[PDB]
Design a protein around this ligand. Structure first.
Ligand SMILES: [Mg+2]
Ligand SMILES: [Mg+2]
Ligand SMILES: [Mg+2]
Ligand SMILES: [Mg+2]
Ligand SMILES: [Mg+2]
Ligand SMILES: [Mg+2]
Ligand SMILES: [Mg+2]
Ligand SMILES: [Mg+2]
Ligand SMILES: [Mg+2]
Ligand SMILES: [Mg+2]
Ligand SMILES: [Mg+2]
Ligand SMILES: [Mg+2]
Ligand SMILES: [Mg+2]
Ligand SMILES: [Mg+2]
Ligand SMILES: [Mg+2]
Ligand SMILES: [Mg+2]
Ligand SMILES: [Mg+2]
Ligand SMILES: [Mg+2]
Ligand SMILES: [Mg+2]
Ligand SMILES: [Mg+2]
Ligand SMILES: [Mg+2]
Ligand SMILES: [Mg+2]
Ligand SMILES: [Mg+2]
Ligand SMILES: [Mg+2]
Ligand SMILES: [Mg+2]
Ligand SMILES: [Mg+2]
Ligand SMILES: [Mg+2]
Ligand SMILES: [Mg+2]
Ligand SMILES: [Mg+2]
Ligand SMILES: [Mg+2]
Ligand SMILES: [Mg+2]
Ligand SMILES: [Mg+2]
Ligand SMILES: [Mg+2]
Ligand SMILES: [Mg+2]
Ligand SMILES: [Mg+2]
Ligand SMILES: [Mg+2]
Ligand SMILES: [Mg+2]
Ligand SMILES: [Mg+2]
Ligand SMILES: [Mg+2]
Ligand SMILES: [Mg+2]
Ligand SMILES: [Mg+2]
Ligand SMILES: [Mg+2]
Ligand SMILES: [Mg+2]
Lengths: 68, 51, 147, 52, 187, 103
RNA sequence: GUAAGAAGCCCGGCUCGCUGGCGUGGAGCCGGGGUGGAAUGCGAGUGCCUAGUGGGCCACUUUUGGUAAGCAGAACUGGC
RNA sequence: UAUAGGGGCGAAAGACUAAUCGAACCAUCUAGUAGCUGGUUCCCUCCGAAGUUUCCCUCAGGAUAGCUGGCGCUCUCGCCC
RNA sequence: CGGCUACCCACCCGACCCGUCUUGAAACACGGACCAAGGAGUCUAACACGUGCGCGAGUCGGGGGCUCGCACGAAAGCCGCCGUGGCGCAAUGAAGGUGAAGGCCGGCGCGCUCGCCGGCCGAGGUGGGAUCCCGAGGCCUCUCCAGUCCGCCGAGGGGCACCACCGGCCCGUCUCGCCCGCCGCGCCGGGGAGGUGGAGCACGAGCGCACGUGUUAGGACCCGAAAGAUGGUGAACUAUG
RNA sequence: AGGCUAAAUACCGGCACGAGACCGAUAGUCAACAAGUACCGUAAGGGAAAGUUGAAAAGAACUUUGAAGAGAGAGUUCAA
């Protein structure tokens, strides 16, 4: 009652029935896995960007609109 | 025989410091007092025992 | 509808929708949840994780009756009383506030959400959350505990 | 027993008349109205059959 | 043989609406005529949404239909919804905007008529805008359906966050082997 | 035996449920029987009203249903003594008497 | 296997509780400038439900065991 | 006349026990279960495989993935790039 | 006269007897003498998905009641201070329990890796994103003038559905830190900043009905056993007293 | 640690009754009929097949072949 054990015949033809797909697109890539000390940098940097970017960038926009 | 009584109490003015005293902490303080009522009595009995 | 059933459409095919080779006879894999640990672990696991074992305490004679506390939100806190009532009670009259008694509506515990306007009310309930209590203090209402 | 769309039914407690999907539903009147025929492309009745 | 390519004959599409509603078929006829005779891609998309199923047309809500017109540039525009606009318990004030939807609920219609807005139907929307000018087409929360929260690669293999089927959401039901590290494995 | 992603089922049909099937085919029959029973009661018994004895105002023992009210069973002998009438005289007047209900 | 661009370059400026001789470095955020960046062909992405299948064989070429087999067992491709 | 079924009887062959005996006959549970043979009922149109990975007291079977069909949704083109 | 045709015959060519188990059937593989009737995926419950309908943050009378005694009426109509109740609108914990809003401006405490007061907006931001809006400019038999008219558009803006990422809030554990309150100052409660696990929130879409597919329990696509138990009938054959 | 009591509930046995999106003599109960009958086994027990003339019997008087079964004429009936 010996049977055929293992083969990879008729496998690439099944693979190319659907055109094997790259993930091909991740705009603004996934962030998990990166260094937790770098995350402790980046989250506080982002929320203080939300806090204190207003007036200096506003005056810089006024200055660059006056210059050009 | 139902007679579902309907109390309304529609008009009253905003009042004194009941609104400053009836906060969330009263329920937690009452819960902690009900959970630690008897152990304080045991500690009072032990304080009376230890002279 | 047997005339809409697939069986009337499949009259003429020999094996009748179940193959000549595999031969689905009576019960090929078992019955019900057979082999939950032995040979169907890729179906019981990977589709129902957590299914095997004990988890916690065993509260004997439990009822879903003592822990009865329907939660009302601050969005649902207004329409228990009609809109005519709150308009004619907060149409710039005086410092009086209407009373919304959620125990009459059947809801016991008041929880917090957003969308609570400036016009203050008085809420009588058996329980509160600190978030909803701070929202009532922020809009200027009165938090009243009842039994 | 049923009412109009202004009031509710006075005999049935929680019933109102259904919502009317197309109010003025004369499709020939709509398609021959000047408001629709103001914004039509052109009557294109050429056939352009197979040329041997 | 000619084509070595696979025979994928029909693409995906639903041509005729499967609903046998006579009023829906009349709206399909009218907006099909407008979509093929007015060069209006708004009429194209509204005709496709009338071809769309009952389930894939989610019910719009009154607070969302306010907030999509609260944005600057949507003051004098009309809100066109292929679907139902329902009541919301959350909001208190309703603006003076116009509504063009199918099968608006009774409390929503009552509050719009109290606020002073104007509700319409699709035949009146077609008579007022054949090309669809002055309109904003809206859609509703499809992914917030209870059915779509069971859909994923797995219930728990990269923990997968996708809600396995069970009777009672609580203790003793699917919480032991694969849900905690003390009992066997953990996801 | 199981399949693709679906809820685990434990149906209680292993016991021979085919013998013990009770289906309400006599549900309009019981409806007509009980209509005739009520009408024959109102004919034959008395000009006493239907649901003859009067039921008390009674609160429901729970943390759940005690906000509501209920028609009870009987008038709680201390209450009947304060009302000032005899027990079986009250039962013949139409007062429902339950000796167990406290106050 | 990777790259053959607008998701890419360049300039100016804020934030950081990361780092630190230094406005040093690195990440994030904001504003602006120019899209003609190998060939060929094709209109693409994505969600749900499920049957059958889970005994294979043959042929060129590369091979394992056997003296060899219409023998047993592998790789690519094609066919039954 | 007595011994009646896991019982009887046996100068012992596991032989006999109503043409059936290495556990009689009749009825009921019972339509016992079977991964195992056989069969499975009108037409036309369209698409269309696999005998492979892993796991199982698994090797005639099942679960999973792959292959497949159906139902759609989101867009793109018809008017020097 | 013409006629395809379930009529018969001849001629040329091709043509092994169907169904299945199988890699392989015409097989020296199995079932089939012939014919007529019957004969095999049904039904219930539960779940999931898709579709259609009504109502829609609600939905549903299936449980009863009301009508005069009506064949069809074992139907149908109504209840609403009959919504008790099921599902959903809130989850997280084994549990005690707890429980989903933030943003902007001005002032103060050393705007302090730091809390408070007054006013305003209100479910955040980024890159895509059908559609929509504004619009330089161009074009209709001779000149200035015009209104709708024939008529697209570089560029710009607001941005459904959903996608990808960041940030925010809720619960349970983990780390580090200071403050507040007294129906009573205590091994009392609450709050802060980070990294986590959850079937969560981040303007909710469910309920009921019906149909289709699939799975499970029921005899369950049809037929099939060696076996087990329960209760009775036989020594007219045979075996022994 | 003594006791009774109608009610709403169940009823594939029985007596009478009504209805059917059910079957229509290989179906429906085994049994539309002299059906638990014929018949089988010592016994417990097993257990069938089997409806239809015509409106009315008016069921073909009479002649003839044959011993009769049967046949050829004649007749009844809308139709042998
Ligand atoms: Mg194999
Ligand atoms: Mg087939
Ligand atoms: Mg096989
Ligand atoms: Mg199978
Ligand atoms: Mg061809
Ligand atoms: Mg093909
Ligand atoms: Mg299967
Ligand atoms: Mg059984
Ligand atoms: Mg199948
Ligand atoms: Mg080989
Ligand atoms: Mg071999
Ligand atoms: Mg070939
Ligand atoms: Mg011997
Ligand atoms: Mg021997
Ligand atoms: Mg013998
Ligand atoms: Mg034996
Ligand atoms: Mg035996
Ligand atoms: Mg069977
Ligand atoms: Mg059997
Ligand atoms: Mg194997
Ligand atoms: Mg086989
Ligand atoms: Mg599979
Ligand atoms: Mg597919
Ligand atoms: Mg396909
Ligand atoms: Mg085969
Ligand atoms: Mg073979
Ligand atoms: Mg063959
Ligand atoms: Mg043979
Ligand atoms: Mg044969
Ligand atoms: Mg034969
Ligand atoms: Mg037949
Ligand atoms: Mg559905
Ligand atoms: Mg309720
Ligand atoms: Mg045994
Ligand atoms: Mg016995
Ligand atoms: Mg004898
Ligand atoms: Mg002898
Ligand atoms: Mg007693
Ligand atoms: Mg009784
Ligand atoms: Mg017959
Ligand atoms: Mg018979
Ligand atoms: Mg007769
Ligand atoms: Mg005739």
């Amino acid at each position: 009652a010996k049977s055929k054990n293992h083969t990879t015949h008729n496998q690439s033809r099944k693979w190319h029935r659907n055109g094997i797909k790259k993930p091909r697109s991740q705009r603004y890539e996934s962030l998990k896995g990166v260094d937790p000390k770098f995350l402790r940098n980046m989250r506080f940097a982002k929320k203080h960007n939300k806090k204190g970017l207003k007036k200096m960038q506003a005056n810089n926009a006024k200055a660059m609109s006056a210059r050009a | 025989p139902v007679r579902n009584v309907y109390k309304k109490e529609k008009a009253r003015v905003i009042t004194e410091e009941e609104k400053n005293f009836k906060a969330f902490a009263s329920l937690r303080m009452a819960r902690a007092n009900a959970r630690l009522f008897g152990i304080r009595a045991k500690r009072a009995k032990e304080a009376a025992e230890q002279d | 509808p047997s005339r809409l059933r697939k069986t009337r459409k499949l009259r003429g095919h020999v094996s009748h929708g179940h193959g000549r080779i595999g031969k689905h006879r009576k019960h090929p894999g078992g019955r019900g949840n057979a082999g939950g640990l032995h040979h169907h672990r890729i179906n019981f696991d990977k589709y129902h994780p957590g299914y095997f074992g004990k988890v916690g305490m065993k509260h004997y004679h439990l009822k879903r009756n003592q822990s009865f506390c329907p939660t009302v939100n601050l969005d649902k806190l207004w329409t228990l009383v009609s809109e005519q009532t709150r308009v004619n009670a907060a149409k710039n009259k005086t410092g009086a506030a209407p009373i919304i008694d959620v125990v009459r509506s059947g809801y016991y515990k008041v929880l917090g959400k957003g969308k609570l306007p400036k016009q203050p009310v008085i809420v009588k309930a058996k329980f509160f959350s600190r978030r909803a209590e701070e929202k009532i203090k922020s809009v200027g209402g009165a938090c009243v505990l009842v039994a | 027993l049923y009412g109009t769309w202004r009031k509710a039914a006075s005999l049935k407690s929680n019933y109102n008349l259904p919502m009317h999907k197309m109010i003025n539903t004369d499709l020939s009147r709509i398609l021959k109205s000047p408001e629709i025929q103001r914004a039509l492309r052109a009557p294109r009745k050429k056939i352009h059959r197979r040329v041997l | 043989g000619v084509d070595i390519r696979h025979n994928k004959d029909r693409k995906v599409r639903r041509k005729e609406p499967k609903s046998q509603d006579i009023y829906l078929r009349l709206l399909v006829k009218l907006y099909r005529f407008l979509a093929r005779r007015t060069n209006s891609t708004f009429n194209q998309v509204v005709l496709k949404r009338l071809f769309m199923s009952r389930t894939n047309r989610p019910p719009l809500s009154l607070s969302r239909m306010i907030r999509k017109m609260k944005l600057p540039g949507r003051e004098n525009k009309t809100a066109v919804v292929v679907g139902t606009i329902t009541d919301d318990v959350r909001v208190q004030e309703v603006p003076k905007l116009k509504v063009c939807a199918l099968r608006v609920t009774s409390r929503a219609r009552s509050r719009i008529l109290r606020a002073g807005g104007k509700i319409l139907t699709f035949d009146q929307l077609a008579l007022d805008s054949p090309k669809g000018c002055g309109t904003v087409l809206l859609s509703g929360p499809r992914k917030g359906r209870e059915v779509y929260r069971h859909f994923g690669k797995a219930p728990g293999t990269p923990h997968s966050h996708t809600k396995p089927y069970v009777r009672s959401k609580g203790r003793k039901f699917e919480r032991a082997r694969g849900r905690r590290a003390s009992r066997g494995y953990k996801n | 035996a199981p399949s693709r992603n679906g809820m685990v089922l434990k149906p209680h049909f292993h016991k021979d449920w085919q013998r013990r099937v009770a289906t309400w085919f006599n549900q309009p029959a019981r409806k007509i029987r009980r209509r005739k029973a009520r009408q024959a009661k109102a004919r034959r018994i008395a000009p006493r009203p239907a649901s003859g004895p009067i039921r008390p105002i009674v609160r429901c023992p729970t943390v759940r249903y005690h906000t509501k009210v209920r028609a009870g069973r009987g008038f709680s002998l201390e209450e009947l003594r304060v009302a000032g009438i005899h027990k079986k005289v009250a039962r013949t007047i139409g007062i429902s008497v339950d000796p167990r209900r406290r106050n």
